[PDB]
Each structure stands twice: as C-alpha cells, then as structure tokens.
C-alpha cells in the first residue's frame, strides 16, 4: 500500500533523461579524446571530472560551478512532480526545450520521439560499453 | 498605519511620509517593532554620547593610570583601556592589581556598570512578569527618565521625540564616519 516502485511515467522520464545525457556523453568522450580547451587540466575522459574537482584554479573552478549550477537549476525547475505516481501534468521528458520548433505536428512529434528514444538507447549502450570496456580491459573489443 | 504608528517615519516636507523601509522589515517582522524602536533609540543615545567622546579627549584628558589615559588617539584608547586579559572580559585572579600587565582596565568597570544598568532597565521593562504590557510601541525607548521635562502638549512631545530620533540617527552615522576616518588617517577632530 506504499508506492515504493515508480510509475511508467517516471520510468520514461528517467529513460529520456539518460538517453539525452548519454547522447551528450558519448560525443563528449570522443571530442575530449580529440580536442581540448586551454586552462583545463589534461586527463582522460574517465578522470577529467576528478582532476577538475581536485585542481580548481584559474577557470576550471568557475566553469564547473557554472555547469553544476545550471544542472541543479534545470533539475529543480523541471522536477517531474508526481510522475512517480503517474499524475504528472506534462508529458514525460517534455521540458519544452524547442528553440527552433523543428517538431510541432503530432505525427512528427511521435516519429521524433521514437527516433530520440532509439538514439538515446544506443548512446546509453555505447556509454556503458565504454565504461565497462575501460574498467575491464577485455570486455569490449573497441576499447 | 506604517510600522505600527511609530514616530520617526515622516519626511521633512509637510504632507509626504518618508517611511524609509526599503527591505520592508516592519511588515516582515511587525511583532518586533517595539524592540526595533528600543534598539534604534539605544543606538542613537550611545552614538550621541560616543561622538562627543571622540571629540573631547583631544581637548582634555583626565589623569588616570597612564596605561590607558596616555593613549595617543581615540582609536587606540579602547585597546589601551580594555587591557590585555587572557580572555576578552576575564578578570585576572592571580594578579588582581595588574602587576603582570594582564588585567582588565577601566573599560571593564564601565562595562560592568553598563550591564547592571541594562539588566535593571531594559530587560526589566521587557521580560518582567509583573510588567505584563511591558515593552510596547507606545512606550518603546521610554524609561521615564526626565519625562517631567518634555512639553505637556502631545504634538510638542511628538516633535521632541522626533528630534531625539533624528539626532540619534545623525549621531550614529557621524560616529561611524568619525571612528572610521580616525582609524584610516589617525588625525585630530576634523577627521576625528
């Protein structure tokens, strides 16, 4: 009689959040391997955050403060209220972030939702493969 | 009304109320308005005394013990008179007469008397069980000391209270400026 396990609304919200985060994270790993930004410590993708935390000086401290503040503000502003029960007013993952209004029609919205979910799942799997391959050298061929 | 009808919120120009509460502290904490008025008047009184106390020592100095009364300026006067106790307000027990130089000075005496007066006047008026109305907006800052002097007319009494409040506020600001300027330049009266 206590709602210990989340509603499918919360599950879809978390799935979309993970898909977006991992879609950013995979390209971030590749682009951190390739490029770099002056003023930030040199480290692999699996230690960059720890290095930034350990050596805040110059611009890295301010930058990581900015990133953390932005993330926390966004999470607070778009907390999935009552989605744990399924009584969430807005659609799961619908933060309203559509600056360019690429998708507006219902059919286009559904097709784009499916495409986003597929790509987010692929990115989640790729990021998990990266992490597991690095932390168990022989687990994944590419890494 | 504004700030529970307390005096002092009226502009110099007739017909306009200055009502200076930028932070809206009166509305935010109305139940503490009598306490705020008491604190304002107390600060004004201590400040009106303290400004003249910054000015006069330059003209005259009483010949007390030279450990403090030989202080160069008002900035160092507090440090000289407070002594060098092992703890800020701790009397030396082994060396009561200050032969080791670690004894509180005359500022401790005046502080103790100020504490007695405070506990017997302000805390007495505010917290005493036998004084149930206690500290209210009407009597805030009123200890009946010299009340026989103020003019009988209620309008003139209000004007005199307003004069007290304005002079106390001006003295607060003036003492702040005077002591800060004294610290910065360490000069005589013009920068106190």
């Amino acid at each position: 009689g206590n709602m210990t396990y989340p509603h499918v609304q919360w599950l879809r919200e978390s799935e979309l959040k993970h898909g977006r985060c991992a879609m950013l994270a995979i390209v971030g790993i590749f682009a951190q391997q390739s490029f770099h930004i002056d003023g930030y410590p040199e480290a692999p993708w699996y230690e960059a955050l720890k290095a930034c935390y350990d050596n805040p000086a110059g611009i890295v401290g301010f930058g990581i403060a900015q990133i953390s503040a932005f993330a926390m503000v966004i999470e607070g502003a778009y907390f999935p209220k009552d989605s744990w029960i399924g009584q969430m007013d807005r659609e799961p993952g619908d933060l309203g972030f559509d600056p360019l209004k690429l998708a507006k029609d219902a059919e286009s919205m559904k097709s784009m939702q499916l495409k986003e979910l597929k790509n987010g799942r692929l990115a989640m799997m790729a990021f998990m493969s990266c992490v597991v391959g690095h932390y168990v050298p022989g687990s994944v061929p590419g890494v | 009304p504004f700030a529970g009808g307390l005096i002092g919120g009226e502009s110099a120009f007739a017909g306009q109320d200055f009502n200076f509460d930028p932070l809206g502290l009166a509305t935010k904490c109305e139940k503490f308005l009598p306490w705020f008025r008491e604190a304002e008047l107390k600060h004004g009184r201590i400040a009106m005394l303290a400004w003249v106390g910054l000015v006069a020592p330059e003209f005259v100095r009483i010949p007390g013990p030279e450990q403090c009364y030989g202080a160069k300026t008002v900035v160092e006067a507090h440090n000289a008179c407070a002594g060098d106790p092992y703890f800020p307000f701790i009397i030396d027990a082994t060396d009561f007469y200050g032969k080791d130089g670690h004894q509180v000075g005359p500022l401790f005496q005046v502080f103790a008397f100020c504490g007695a007066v405070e506990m017997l006047t302000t805390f007495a008026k505010t917290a005493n069980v036998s004084n149930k109305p206690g500290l209210t907006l009407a009597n805030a800052g009123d200890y009946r000391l010299g009340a026989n002097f103020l003019p009988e007319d209620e309008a003139k009494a209000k004007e005199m209270k307003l004069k007290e409040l304005k002079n106390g506020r001006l003295a607060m600001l003036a003492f702040g400026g005077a002591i800060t300027q004294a610290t910065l330049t360490g000069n005589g009266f013009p920068w106190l």
Binding site: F62, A65 | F18, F20
Partner: protein, 173 residues
C-alpha cells in the same frame, strides 16, 4: 506588433527575418522584455568599458590576494583577473535585483518594473518612482530607451571585438 514601441524614422518595423510574422503576443512580449534588459546591460557595459580607461577605484579588489583595482586591466582580460568569487557575487547582486526588487507591475507592457524615468526608482533605497504622466513624454522616453539600448548592444560587441583584436580595449588609439 508594428504599432508597438521601437519604430522610428530611420527604419520602420524592420523584421527582415519576419520572426514576429506569427503575431504571437506572448512571444513578442518576451522578446521586448529581453531586448530592454539586454540594452540596459549593454549601456552599463559600455560605460564600464569607458570609465576604467580614465579612472580606477582605489583600494583592494581582493585584499586576500593583494589584488588592487589598478592591478586588473579593464576589458575582456578582466574575466580571468577578477576572482571567480567576485564574479559570483556580482551574479548574486544581479539575481537579487532580478528576483526581489524588480517585479513586473503590468504584464501587458514588458520591461517596466515601476522604477520610473531613467530607472531612477532604484537610485537609492527607500524611494518609489512615478511614471511620466504625459503620454507623449512616456512614448518619447521609452523610444529613446530602446534606441540607446540597441546602440549600446552594438557598441559593446564592437568593444569586445576591439579588445580581441588588440590586448587593450583601445589598442588602436
């Protein structure tokens, strides 16, 4: 939104991209509010580029680091020199003045928080400003505000470009 404030002799409606063609009143209101805020901040930034060139404050910007106002150079170079703590506290002051003491009195007209002409209701604490009674005066003042905001928005970008081109904000001179 052609009749709204911001149309004058040099150009008319001037919406080449037609971003306001959809005629969404809420979107136009947000756009105008952001325009006014950007213009005001740009005017502040232009003056803050202009004044340090001649006058620099006395004292220590960061006494802990022995950083004097004369040590740090004005311009984009100041972002690194001024401590992140100082930048965060500037952000904190701006957030205070955005959330607490700047409140939209009327949603119909954006960018107006009741601070009066030349935003003089925030000159000093403890004063309340009044809107200009004359409709012509209101219109002229608001149009001047918007035009100067646009000019400062362009000028601050120009000064950033000059600071990039030459280490000092006025290297050419």
């Amino acid at each position: 939104f052609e009749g709204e404030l911001g149309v004058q002799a040099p150009v008319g409606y001037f919406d080449p991209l037609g971003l306001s063609k959809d005629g969404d009143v809420e979107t136009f209101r947000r756009r105008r509010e952001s325009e006014l805020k950007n213009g005001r901040v740009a005017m502040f930034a232009t003056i803050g580029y202009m004044v340090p060139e001649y006058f620099k404050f006395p004292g220590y910007l960061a006494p802990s680091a022995s950083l004097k106002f004369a040590d740090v150079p004005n311009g984009i170079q100041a972002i690194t020199k001024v401590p992140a703590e100082g930048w965060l506290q500037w952000v904190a002051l701006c957030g205070c003045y955005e959330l607490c003491v700047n409140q939209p009195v009327d949603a119909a007209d954006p960018g107006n928080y009741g601070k009066g002409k030349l935003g003089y209701g925030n000159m000093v604490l403890g004063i309340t400003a009044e809107s200009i009674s004359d409709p012509e005066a209101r219109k002229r003042g608001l149009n001047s505000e918007l035009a100067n905001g646009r000019l400062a928005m362009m000028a601050i970008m120009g000064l950033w470009v000059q600071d990039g081109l030459f280490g000092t904000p006025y290297g050419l001179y």
